[PDB]
Amino acid sequence: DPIADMISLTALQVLPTAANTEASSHRLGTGVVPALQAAETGASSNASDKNLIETRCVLNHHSTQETAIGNFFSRAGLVSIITMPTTGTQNTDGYVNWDIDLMGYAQLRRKCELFTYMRFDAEFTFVVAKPNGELVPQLLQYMYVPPGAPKPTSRDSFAWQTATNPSVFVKMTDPPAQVSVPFMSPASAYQWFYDGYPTFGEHLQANDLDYGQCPNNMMGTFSIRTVGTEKSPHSITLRVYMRIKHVRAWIPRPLRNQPYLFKTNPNYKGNDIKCTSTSRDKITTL
């Protein structure tokens, strides 16, 4: 050989129940000090009940299953309200195009933002009715328009031929429509936070709205209409619910503690910065 120079301390465990407590007695000695720690290392304390007090034995059968990320997320929650009025400002044309973005509602958003990256399949349920909750015999069409596919421009656009895009035809009187959706990102996981820009070039203040936008999260358009060449006399409200399933999450982060202002960024109300915890008068009184 002519040139010599050319030649994870963590594993998963199955913990179905909470740790038991072993009985301990008194310890009176030197050299050993379990109560003293050094938080500077970045590690959490390893001290346990038996190190600081005399304990009895407790056979703990308390389950740890409900805190599995799967059971935390697999509960359908509202992610969009699409209205289609008959008279007024909004689309009175009998059709609506909605760009898919699940960051419009707080409850579900705060739960997802607990993690940086998430990969999952989802069950979407479509609850439709009139603005006052009544139901009428109306035929509807829901169509998924992937990025790059022609978006319908009217109630009779050719796009509704849906020869390749997946469509769902259902009556407002039928039960809520429901379908399963796979993990569709071009990347290996969706990311609720993208500290970067989508393209190269200079980033002048005129295009600062690009910051934080990652195409890997842009899944396309969800189009809906009333099936017919004539206008429908009924106002329609579509509530979309998403249920995460077969989920995997990476990198936990601090939970949102300021009200949400916009879908596409973490901006907060600067003049009214809420304190994470409520306050009191003195530090020595409850």
Partner: protein, 51 residues
Amino acid sequence: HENSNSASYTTINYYKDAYAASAGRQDMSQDPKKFTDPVMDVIHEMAPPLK
């Protein structure tokens, strides 16, 4: 059999695509250490974490 196109073991399914399957029973695997004790010299519980 079916297509292995699930985003990610005791699920139910009637369609040819795996992602259509239910959530199934959640497993109870954990690895707290990567978050609670990510230090090189694994600090013990008896002697002082600095010496």
